[PDB]
Design an enzyme around this catalytic site. Sequence first.
Site, mmCIF file in Angstrom:
data_model
loop_
_atom_site.group_PDB
_atom_site.id
_atom_site.type_symbol
_atom_site.label_atom_id
_atom_site.label_comp_id
_atom_site.label_asym_id
_atom_site.label_seq_id
_atom_site.Cartn_x
_atom_site.Cartn_y
_atom_site.Cartn_z
ATOM 1 N N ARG A 1 0.598 -1.216 0.614
ATOM 2 C CA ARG A 1 -0.043 0.382 0.105
ATOM 3 C C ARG A 1 0.819 1.111 0.658
ATOM 4 N NH1 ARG A 1 -4.179 -0.087 -1.796
ATOM 5 N NH2 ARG A 1 -5.307 1.600 -0.493
ATOM 6 N N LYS B 1 14.721 -10.625 -2.932
ATOM 7 C CA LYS B 1 14.393 -11.155 -1.860
ATOM 8 C C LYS B 1 15.398 -10.832 -0.820
ATOM 9 C CE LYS B 1 12.502 -15.447 -2.782
ATOM 10 N NZ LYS B 1 12.545 -16.780 -3.356
ATOM 11 N N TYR C 1 12.683 -4.376 7.344
ATOM 12 C CA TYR C 1 14.378 -4.009 7.450
ATOM 13 C C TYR C 1 13.462 -2.221 8.159
ATOM 14 C CZ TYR C 1 14.717 -7.408 4.130
ATOM 15 O OH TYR C 1 15.050 -8.488 3.228
ATOM 16 N N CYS D 1 1.938 6.883 10.449
ATOM 17 C CA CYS D 1 0.877 7.580 9.977
ATOM 18 C C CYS D 1 0.031 8.521 11.597
ATOM 19 C CB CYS D 1 0.064 7.175 9.506
ATOM 20 S SG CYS D 1 -0.373 5.693 10.170
ATOM 21 N N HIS E 1 -8.518 4.382 14.352
ATOM 22 C CA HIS E 1 -8.137 4.003 13.233
ATOM 23 C C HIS E 1 -8.843 2.966 12.380
ATOM 24 C CE1 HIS E 1 -4.449 2.946 10.635
ATOM 25 N NE2 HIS E 1 -3.975 3.950 11.423
ATOM 26 N N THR F 1 -5.861 -2.045 8.272
ATOM 27 C CA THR F 1 -4.709 -3.026 7.719
ATOM 28 C C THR F 1 -4.174 -3.823 6.599
ATOM 29 O OG1 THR F 1 -3.070 -2.616 9.581
ATOM 30 C CG2 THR F 1 -3.707 -0.296 9.564
ATOM 31 N N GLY G 1 2.481 2.764 20.347
ATOM 32 C CA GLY G 1 3.840 3.564 20.714
ATOM 33 C C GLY G 1 3.593 4.872 19.904
#
Lengths: 333, 333, 333, 333
Positions: free
Chosen positions: D11, D77, D99, D150, D177, D180, D210
């Site tokens: 997305r 990959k 990552y 976000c 929210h 997702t 957080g």
Amino acid sequence: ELTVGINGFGRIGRLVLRVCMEKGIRVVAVNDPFIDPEYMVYMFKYDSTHGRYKGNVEHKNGQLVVDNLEINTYQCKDPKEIPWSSIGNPYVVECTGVYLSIEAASAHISSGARRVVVTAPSPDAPMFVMGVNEKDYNPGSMTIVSNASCTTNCLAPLAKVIHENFGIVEGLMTTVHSYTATQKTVDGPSKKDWRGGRGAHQNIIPSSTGAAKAVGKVIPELKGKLTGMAFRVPTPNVSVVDLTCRLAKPASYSAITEAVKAAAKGPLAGILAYTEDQVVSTDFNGNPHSSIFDAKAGIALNDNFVKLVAWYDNEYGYSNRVVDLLRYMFSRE
Amino acid sequence: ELTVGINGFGRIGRLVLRVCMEKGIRVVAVNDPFIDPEYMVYMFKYDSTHGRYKGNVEHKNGQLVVDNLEINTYQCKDPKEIPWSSIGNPYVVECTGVYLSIEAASAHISSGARRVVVTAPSPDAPMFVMGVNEKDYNPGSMTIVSNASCTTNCLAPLAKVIHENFGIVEGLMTTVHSYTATQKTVDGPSKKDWRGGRGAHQNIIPSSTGAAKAVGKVIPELKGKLTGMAFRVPTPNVSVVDLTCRLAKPASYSAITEAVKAAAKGPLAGILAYTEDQVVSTDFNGNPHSSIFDAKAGIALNDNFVKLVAWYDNEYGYSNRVVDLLRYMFSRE
Amino acid sequence: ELTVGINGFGRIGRLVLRVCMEKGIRVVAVNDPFIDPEYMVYMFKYDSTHGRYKGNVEHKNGQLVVDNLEINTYQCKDPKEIPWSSIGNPYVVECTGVYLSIEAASAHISSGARRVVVTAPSPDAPMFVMGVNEKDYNPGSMTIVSNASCTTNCLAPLAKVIHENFGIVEGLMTTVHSYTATQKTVDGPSKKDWRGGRGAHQNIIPSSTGAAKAVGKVIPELKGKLTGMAFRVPTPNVSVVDLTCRLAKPASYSAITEAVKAAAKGPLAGILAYTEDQVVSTDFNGNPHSSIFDAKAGIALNDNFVKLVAWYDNEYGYSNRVVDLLRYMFSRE
Amino acid sequence: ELTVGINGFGRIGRLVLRVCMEKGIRVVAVNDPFIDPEYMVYMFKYDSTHGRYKGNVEHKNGQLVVDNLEINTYQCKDPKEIPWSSIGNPYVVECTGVYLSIEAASAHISSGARRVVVTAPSPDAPMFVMGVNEKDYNPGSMTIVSNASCTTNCLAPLAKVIHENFGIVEGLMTTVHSYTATQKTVDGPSKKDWRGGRGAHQNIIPSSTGAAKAVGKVIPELKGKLTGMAFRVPTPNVSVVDLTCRLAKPASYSAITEAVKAAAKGPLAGILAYTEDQVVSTDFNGNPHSSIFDAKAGIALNDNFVKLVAWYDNEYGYSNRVVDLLRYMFSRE
């Protein structure tokens, strides 16, 4: 007596366990490589569509304990490594969706399963719809079996009645189907079903199903006379079959409803039900029937061309049939 | 030039206004007994499914002002009391759903409307589907007209192509339809449509529609050859037609798609569209076409028995056709 | 004994009837001007969120018959015309949302109702939350009473515990609330709550509620110390209170949970419940409690500033309290 | 000039590409191990929440072609194997979610990326919110950077204004929210977020974030003064921040709105917006702002204790900021 091992603790595995508890069938093991015992408790205890489990569920010493029934648990990635033979030789319900062929499912057999029911259509395993062809099951030759699909289980009983009374020359089926676990919350990857990757919640999603054609496998006289497709829509459970068929013998709409009504009260009792009420999908959430004929929803253009409507709880009804098939198979040992 | 008055500022009235702005058609008045001018601004400015209006909207001196266009507003409960004649003699779009008959709608005429388009099927008013029969409109005799239904506008163009190329012996239609303003958020009162009172958001809801049969009114050769029904499902907009038909002349699936494709590129351009993409409903939100044929979603049992799929934005496509009909009617004065 | 008449057969009226059946309280009459007896049967028999009624429902001779209990039915538009006095002098549950003041509700009294419970906040009628202030009810002077709101009924019990143990200096509440009958399926008219007219199913909708402030009416020490607001979201039932408060006396989070736990096991049993499980909204559909504290969902910045979470089935929990209030009131005659 | 490679075509990757096209930033490559070029076309062309791409998209010779811009595609990959150095040395947007640390993301660098923006919070990479702390970016030492979340991007700009004008003693945040990609369509496996495995569409789901605490990383004066949590609800996009804070200096509600208004018109233009309209969530779908303050939705208990409301398109707003961060970083080379 009849004892049951279940492979895969997804939606089907969990409801199958619930049904086994309800029908008093002893489950001796659950295997899932990913879901640990403590987590099993949680997933079984609470259910967004079917409500909280009406009994008690706990974890103890690596066992799932349901209403004082101690159930063994395993986390094997390979059916070959599941110790079925060490815990009696149970019938095994194969719910992962990953071992559909007789060869793939036979892994269970080599590890000690007496018989295997695949909770999905199979390329080659004999397929059964309770109320339609279970009597063709033969324990002498059939160690691995399929319970077909939720959809085929709704359509076949209805097709049987219509064909036997009036004759289906040809039929085309649409199922308006609730979204499922294979779908996505938002537009995401589904490389061999692009439409199925699109937001399940936002969309009406066309889908290809072999469910209607597969009726010809359980009702040979209908081979080549049925096919269809699906629309997946934003409901979490309960689906509906919309069968448009041409009939051989002319039949008023009232003759059709009377035939279905008679089947439900008699030979298809507990499999096919009948309603004339102004029902909607949620009215069938938790309904154990394979198919509920909706008399008032259907419509006929004429005595030979009609559109018939039947509801099904794609989760619970199918789960009930899986256990019914196990019980029947066992009565035939 | 062509000037337009709109009665009722519900979903249709508002989108019709939007389309008029987009196509450069002058709207001179909006009437609604309940929605005041300041509130009109809000309802027009923001839209949950179609997004914010892409221009400017304000209220001034009891007028709705859209992109500097000053629009008169009235709050009349009775069409007879709307001063159409004092503001030119506009074509009137009747969107309340309450004045469907020629007699009921004629109230607009007596108060000064030059012509009236009812944005719904009518018991007796002549019915038109752009691309199918608008040429049968006659200004000498037709002061009050109907634009049929969203559903009929999707099916008819497709039925035209299939009938003219192959011949429809008989067809049965299902529309999987988004919920609408007549429905309920939670189980509530709907005394002449009990199912339609049930939670729109929770349910697949069977519904009776005359939309398929009504195709016989705009394509006389199909009178008595079509009927159908609906399932209302939890999507806010965009619907889909599922037509199961028997064909006179045998037609491969590729022959069918080639015929539709040709119609879309040619005579039905802007009305009927064609796709081979792996589309879902949201892909047609805001699409102005009456019908978008979905080649890959459909399925044939054989050359004479097929199931055809076509999408429609039940709000926007229909609204576009209403304005198209106004424009055509005006070109005929 | 205690006999009950119910005015309005909407969501509350129907669930109140269900609860009365469950708790063995005799309902002698239902009045609704719009919903006829045959339709009542349908609306009571089937429920999209709470499932089918687990007993029997029929209509006979203008009477609603539930599990063999014959219940009178009326269609009076005016409370004054309901023959309460002719069928004993039952307590009346006023569920229309239209007669909230003591003056308006007193119409029931003049027609023979012994007492009236308004199932909504009232501008002037004494307000009660079971487990918090019912003991302040006085039969000598209070013929018309309010059961407050669903939200207030969730917050007040929790606020009581926190205030009595630690002291609430000040608090601000948000309730994330399921959509309701006052909302719209698609953007439609709501002239004194514009946001509330917007599609309930597509939107998170800010809403103003006096529910938090109203706690000061049932817990006087909290007058002026609480207020809040709501977000209406696309779920059909079950809501959640999110209370951010500053505490007088410092309290570890574990001290807070221990206090709530003890309250739930003891004095607030049956009103306030306690969980440490990883729950979601559907886990509380059909829960009769006024408030279920969610220990793990809450979070503290420090010992004096915390955010507390409590679930409530806004339909069923509240309906249970209405009946509990009736029973309590009767024990005081 | 500035050239951009994107790793992960989910997305975020897709919307980032869209934004780059819109802002005229050259994307030279897309890498995704699972999504082939032909499929990329489909996923980019159609979007359930953001609509069809308004330009042209094709695949040619292993290249993604967007509005005539030829974009390289890879299926590696391992970030180490992506030939960044062979196609210039672009800035890399790391969108896989896999990552996050400087060490993990540094793989991009060793393969030739000049800099890396991680589109998620990072355990150790410097974190930036445009409009708040981007000026603390230092090209001499920061090759790997994070654009935070976000949520943090919605809260931080608002917190800045409130703190700088009035002083936040302490604050607790709830974000309501949209669901997702990490969530599930029906109750399924989520072993380190059990609640998050529950049906996204059926449930209000408490979630730990957080995001509020992380504001202390971009606004050091607020370290230890903020935390919060989330409720995930059945909407596909757009979310809302609900900030309950105690203020140092007393502030009327009008003083608060005036401060936010001024911030939006001036220094935070394009980051923070301001509205007094009766808005709902869908009104912000496709809004590029990080935060839109909702004046009328908020409520104050008193001059030092207030609840503030701000909307954010969690997909599009954030994607815009990612590109803004890239552009800013480049202006600093």
